[PDB]
């Protein structure tokens, strides 16, 4: 019941943490792109292709984050079906894992991946300082990391916190077109101040209910039942998403959901395979 693959990624996308706002969104919009299960779109918005059922996580990729053009990069370890983030590489060449027992070979780092875990609540998403050197500091916290280091609270801290940062400068940021272009807004040239900034109840919700807002979408490109009018899209206003317009320009890349006369998990792998899939 191991992951199987997690050293075998589907792909490698690569971000300069000093490069341009302009390189992150490519980064960004890179993954989803190579995400994207090719015979489902909603609204040309990519959507991923569903977890294989009644199999551990198989389908990977990894995110190289470096310092500079030249340098080692922290490795990370994301599921290719919901975009989770599992592990990490240090510099040492340890794999970490957030799930004990998750990834053959991995060392638990001591705590989950899981705002819960790494806050304490999923409320405290807009607490969190996004910007250029919070990115560069948690890759340097986590790479830096050695499997003999004695841990400490304010080393566990600080690793809790660089991973809360990654996640949502990656993870979060592949889900959602409002935060990559929230935190893009934030990266610019050397010539300007250094800057940071933290999210607003809307992407905060967002983030708590890609499931949801994925669902909501959905729905609305099934075809309706002899008689009726084409779904509606129903607002999430906590959101801010009102419309399926609205939808689609938040949506990043969207988790499979199984809704009502929508494809299935058999189904959308079937599509996808057949359109060249891995």
Do not use: C
């Given at each position: 019941?191991?992951?199987?693959?997690?050293?075998?990624?589907?792909?490698?996308?690569?971000?300069?943490?000093?490069?341009?706002?302009?390189?992150?969104?490519?980064?960004?919009?890179?993954?989803?792109?190579?995400?994207?299960?090719?015979?489902?779109?909603?609204?040309?918005?990519?959507?991923?292709?569903?977890?294989?059922?009644?199999?551990?996580?198989?389908?990977?990729?990894?995110?190289?984050?470096?310092?500079?053009?030249?340098?080692?990069?922290?490795?990370?370890?994301?599921?290719?079906?919901?975009?989770?983030?599992?592990?990490?590489?240090?510099?040492?060449?340890?794999?970490?894992?957030?799930?004990?027992?998750?990834?053959?070979?991995?060392?638990?780092?001591?705590?989950?991946?899981?705002?819960?875990?790494?806050?304490?609540?999923?409320?405290?998403?807009?607490?969190?300082?996004?910007?250029?050197?919070?990115?560069?500091?948690?890759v340097t916290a986590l790479h830096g990391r050695t499997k003999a280091d004695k841990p400490s609270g304010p080393k566990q801290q600080q690793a809790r916190e660089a991973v809360t940062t990654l996640l949502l400068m990656v993870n979060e940021a592949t889900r959602f077109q409002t935060v990559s272009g929230f935190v893009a807004g934030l990266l610019h040239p050397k010539a300007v101040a250094a800057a940071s900034g933290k999210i607003g109840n809307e992407m905060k919700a967002q983030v708590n209910g890609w499931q949801d807002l994925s669902a909501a979408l959905l729905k609305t490109d099934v075809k309706p039942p002899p008689g009726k009018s084409p779904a509606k899209f129903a607002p999430i206003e906590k959101m801010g998403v009102r419309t399926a317009v609205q939808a689609a320009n938040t949506l990043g890349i969207l988790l499979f959901v199984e809704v009502p006369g929508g494809l299935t998990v058999a189904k959308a792998l079937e599509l996808f395979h057949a359109s060249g899939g891995k």
């Amino acid at each position: 019941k191991m992951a199987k693959n997690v050293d075998k990624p589907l792909f490698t996308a690569t971000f300069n943490v000093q490069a341009s706002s302009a390189d992150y969104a490519t980064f960004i919009a890179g993954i989803r792109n190579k995400l994207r299960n090719p015979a489902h779109f909603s609204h040309n918005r990519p959507v991923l292709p569903p977890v294989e059922p009644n199999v551990p996580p198989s389908r990977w990729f990894h995110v190289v984050l470096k310092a500079s053009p030249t340098s080692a990069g922290l490795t990370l370890a994301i599921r290719a079906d919901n975009i989770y983030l599992e592990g990490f590489k240090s510099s040492d060449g340890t794999w970490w894992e957030l799930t004990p027992g998750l990834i053959p070979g991995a060392t638990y780092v001591g705590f989950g991946g899981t705002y819960r875990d790494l806050l304490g609540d999923t409320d405290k998403l807009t607490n969190v300082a996004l910007g250029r050197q919070q990115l560069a500091d948690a890759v340097t916290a986590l790479h830096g990391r050695t499997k003999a280091d004695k841990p400490s609270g304010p080393k566990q801290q600080q690793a809790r916190e660089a991973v809360t940062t990654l996640l949502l400068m990656v993870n979060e940021a592949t889900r959602f077109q409002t935060v990559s272009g929230f935190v893009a807004g934030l990266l610019h040239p050397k010539a300007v101040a250094a800057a940071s900034g933290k999210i607003g109840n809307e992407m905060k919700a967002q983030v708590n209910g890609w499931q949801d807002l994925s669902a909501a979408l959905l729905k609305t490109d099934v075809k309706p039942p002899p008689g009726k009018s084409p779904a509606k899209f129903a607002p999430i206003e906590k959101m801010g998403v009102r419309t399926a317009v609205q939808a689609a320009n938040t949506l990043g890349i969207l988790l499979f959901v199984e809704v009502p006369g929508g494809l299935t998990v058999a189904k959308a792998l079937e599509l996808f395979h057949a359109s060249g899939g891995k």
